[PDB]
């Protein structure tokens, strides 16, 4: 049920074409153990958050274009975008550019996505969750990869 993006241009397309919702990207692999648990969460909340978030899965072997600049060295990575801008998060712990761990509670993810939506709609480049628990647009990364070669 969750859509997959099979090329770098599709990732950019997915991100460029949403004006009203957070784009949530899961960078990893369907067959990675951490991603299986994470995709379970994402899949089971996708309807709950349809009004303000859309969720895509990206295989970073099939689509490795962002591996370097988004530093996708973890097996499972979730990133948030809004109106073509990467959105940073302050959860209290962990990374600030991505969620690179398997996230147990379904409700936490829904809460984080809502936080991103709220904050990003107000023009904020970093949002801070009410609870305590570089990275340019995909277009720019694609461009930079052209220059290097």
Domain ranges in the chain are 1-149
CATH number of 1-149: 3.40.30.10
The resolution in Å comes to 2.5
- Tokens 């990893």 belong to residue: 28
| Cα separations in angstroms, 109 against 13, 20, 44, 103, 139 | 24, 19, 11, 7, 26
C-beta of residue 76 within 8 angstroms of C-beta of residue 143: no
d(CA 48, CA 54): 11
- Cα 15 to the center of its chain, rounded Å: 10
d(CA 101, CA 94): 9
3-state SS of the chain: helix, strand, coil percent to 5? 35, 20, 45
| Other Cβ atoms within 10 Å of 100 Cβ, number | 21
Which two structure tokens, joined as six digits, stand for 23? 């784009």
Q: How was this structure determined?
A: X-ray
Task: Outline where DSSP puts E strands in 38-102.
Answer: 53-59, 77-82, 85-86, 88-90
């Amino acid at each position: 049920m969750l859509p997959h993006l099979h090329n770098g241009w599709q990732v950019d397309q997915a991100i460029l074409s949403e004006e009203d919702r957070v784009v949530v990207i899961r960078f990893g692999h369907d067959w990675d153990p951490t991603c299986m648990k994470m995709d379970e969460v994402l899949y089971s909340i996708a309807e709950k958050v349809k009004n303000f978030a859309v969720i895509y899965l990206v295989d970073i072997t099939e689509v490795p274009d962002f591996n370097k600049m988004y530093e996708l060295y973890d097996p499972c990575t979730v990133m948030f975008f809004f109106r073509n801008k990467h959105i940073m998060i302050d959860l209290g712990t962990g990374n600030n550019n991505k969620i690179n761990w398997a996230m147990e509670d379904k409700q936490e993810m829904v809460d984080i996505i809502e936080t991103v939506y709220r904050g990003a709609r107000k023009g904020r480049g970093l949002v801070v969750s009410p609870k305590d628990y570089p990275y340019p647009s995909p277009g720019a990364v694609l461009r930079a990869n052209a220059e290097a070669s």
